[model samples]
Target: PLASSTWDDLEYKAIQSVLDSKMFTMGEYVKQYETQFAKTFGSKYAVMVSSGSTANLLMIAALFFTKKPRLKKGDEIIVPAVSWSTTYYPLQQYGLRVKFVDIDINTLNIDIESLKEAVTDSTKAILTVNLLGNPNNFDEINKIIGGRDIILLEDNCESMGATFNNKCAGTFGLMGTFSSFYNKHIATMEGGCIVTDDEEIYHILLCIRAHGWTRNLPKKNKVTGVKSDDQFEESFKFVLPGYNVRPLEMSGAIGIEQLKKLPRFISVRRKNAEYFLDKFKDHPYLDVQQETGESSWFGFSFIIKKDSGVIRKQLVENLNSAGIECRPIVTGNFLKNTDVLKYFDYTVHNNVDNAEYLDKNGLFVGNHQIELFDEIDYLREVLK
Candidate 1:
C-alpha cells in the first residue's frame, strides 16, 4: 500500500516517545499537536480527536450546545450530494434536517449555482464541502450565504493541503475538520483535527471531543458563561452533554512528524498528477477531474468519455491484472446510491445529469508519495 512505507524512523521515534512517557490518552502530546496544527493553518484553536468522523460530530455538536449559537432540532443544514457517509451522518444524528445538493462535475464539489438556487426559508446552515481534496467555490458560496441567515461550514476532510485565493480550504468557514487516516495526505494512524478561529467554539469543541467534562476545559464543571477562575477541580464532573472521542497519545505524537512532511507530500503528489495529466490529456474515453484552485491530487480520478463504451468494471479488473489499484470516485452520486434520503428532507438542485454520469463512468487509482511513471504508463496501456 502507498501508506505503509511512507513513514520512516521519524514517525516511529515520535510514537516511541509517547510510549515512554506512560501517560497515554490526550495529554501534553495531544495539546502540542493541536497547537502546531492550528498555528500551521492560521486558526486560533485546534482540537484533536479519534477520527475524522468524530471530528465532524464535534463540529456539528458545537452548533447546538449551551452558550453556543443553539441551532435547533428542525433547522435544515444543506450538504453536498457526494461525500463520505459520515459527512451527513453527524447532521442527521443531531436531529437537524439535511437537504442535499448535487455536485459540479467539473470540480467534483457542490455546485455554487445549485447552492444559490437551493437556499430556502428553513435553511439555517450550509455544509460547504471540498470533495476529493479539490475545493468548491467558496467565493460564490460565501456570497450566497451572505444573502441568507445560514451559517457556512466546510468539510475539509479531503482537502487539508488545498487552498484557494491564498486562504486554506478549511479555515474559510465557521469550522472545518481534517482527516489524518492512513490514506490521507498526513498519517496520524486514525485521527483528525477541528480548526476554528472563534474562542467560544474552540472551548466547546474541546469539551465535546472528550466526555464533555471540565477536567480538560479551562474552567471545570461550571455552567459555560459563568465567570470564575481555578475555583473548581473535579475530573468526574460532567458540565455538558458529550462523548469520549479523544485521540490516543500515540496518534498525537506521530502527527508531529506527519505535519512536518505535509509540504513535501503535497509537492510530490502534484508532480505525479502533472505527469499523468500530461500523459493522458485528451485520451479517448477519459475525462479528468477539473482543477480550479490548488489540488492536493489525493488520486487521479477519471470518467469514461461518452465516445468510449468502456465497461468500468472490466476496466478495473484489467488494471488489477496489470498490478494497478483502482476504485470508484468516492461512491459517486451518493444521493442516488445511498440510503441517506430515508432519514432527511433534501432537494437535488437543478439536474443531476453530470453526477449520475460520473456515478456510472468515473473511477480513480492510487497516487503514491513518490513518482510512479512506469506504473502510470502501464495503467494507461491497460485502460487502452
Candidate 2:
C-alpha cells in the first residue's frame, strides 16, 4: 500500500541508458534532469541531492553561505510542529534555533495565527512543510511576514505537484524543495531537488551538493569567490563547508522519466482522495484532512474525533487484520520524542494543541496513482 508502480518502459529505458554509460555518479543525466525540473516548476535553477533530508540541509546551509541577509548560528527559524523529522533537523544541525508552531486542524498545515505569534525580531526564517501533499496558506503566510526580514523556505517533499492559487507549491518561497523517494508522488528510488530564483543561492547549492568545491559550479559562481584559469586546479578546490550529498546519475535518469508522469499521477491521487472524502465526510469517528488549496493527495489521513471514544490501537489493529496498511502522520508532533532534543536548541513557542491532537489520533493510509476503489472500499468497511 505504500506506492504503486508509476514507472513504465520510459523509466526502464532511461535507467538502462545510464547503466550502459557506466558513469553512474552525478553528470549529464543529472544536469538534464535539473534543467527539465526547473523548466517544469518555472524556477530559475534546480539542484539535485541524495535525499529529501539532504535537500533541506543544502537549502538551509545555502542561506548561511549567501552574501547579504545571511542566516548565522543561533538565529531563530519558525517551523510547524507537524512534518517529517528532516524538516527540522537541518536547522538544528546548522546551529539555528527552532521555534515550533501549531497547525490548522482542518488543513493539517501551519496555523497562520500560531505563525504570526511565533515570529519575532530574532526570527531569521520560516521553514514550512506542505504536510501530506496539502499546500499551506501562503497568502496569509506572506501577509504575516510581508515586511519582515524573515526568509521563507519550503519542505515540499510531500507536495511535489500541489499548488496554492495558480503558483506551484515549492516555487512559492525564496527557495523550495522536492523529494523523489520510493513512496513520493514520483519515484527515483532515493532522490531530492531544490528550486530557486536566486542565482547566488543556486550557485551555493551547486558547490555544497558536492564536496563544497568549485568542481560543479560555473566559472563565475557567487559562492566560491573565484575560479582558476586551469580547470584541473579549480576542480579540487573547496570553498564552503559542504558534504558529499550528491545524487546518482541513475536516479537522475529515472527522475526525468518519472517526472513525465507527475501530472497524471497527481490527477489519480486527487480522484482517490475525493472518493474517500465523499465516503467519510461526516463519519462520527473520523475527521479527514481538508484541502486548503490544490493538493496532490500524497495519502489519505484520518484523525479520530476527540469525542469518538475510539481507541487508536484497536483501529490500527483492525486495519492491519483487514489487510489495509497504515502509519502515523509524519513523526507525530516531532517534539514529543525527547531523544532527538540533544541535537539542537528548540523552543515550543505556541501550544501545539492541533499537532498534539493529530499526534495522538492521526494515522494515514496510502494513496496511489492507480485506481484504488476496491482497496479504498475495503478500507471504508474496516473503518466502519
TM-score per candidate: 0.94, 0.97
Worst 10 residues of 2 by lDDT: 217-226
Model 1: per-residue Cα lDDT over 235-329, one tens digit each:
55667788999999899899988888888888888888888888888788788888868987777788888868788888778877777777878
With a 3 Å backbone cut-off (N, CA, C), the pairs that clash in candidate 2 are: none
**Candidate 2 lDDT for residue 274:** 88
Candidate with the greatest lDDT versus the true structure: 2
Evaluate all candidate structures by whole-model CA lDDT and list the values in order.
0.81, 0.88
Best TM-score goes to which candidate?
A: 2
* Cα lDDT tens digits for candidate 2, 1-384: 666777889998998898899899899999999999999988989999999989998999888888774888999888888888888778888898888888888899888888888888888889888988999988998899978888898999999999889899999899998999988888899999999999999998988888888888787778766688886787677878889999999999999888788888888889988888888977889999889789999888899998899988898999988878889987788778788877879899858999899988999888899988888788878899
